[PDB]
Amino acid sequence: RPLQWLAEKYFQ
Numbered sequence: 001r002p003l004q005w006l007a008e009k010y011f012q
């Protein structure tokens with residue numbers, strides 16, 4: 001599953 005969207009959205 002893609003982490004990219006999660007990384008971008010919450011952390012960054």
Ligand SMILES: *CCCCC*
Pocket residue numbers: 004007008012
């Ligand atoms: C591809 C996600 C890199 C961190 C924003």
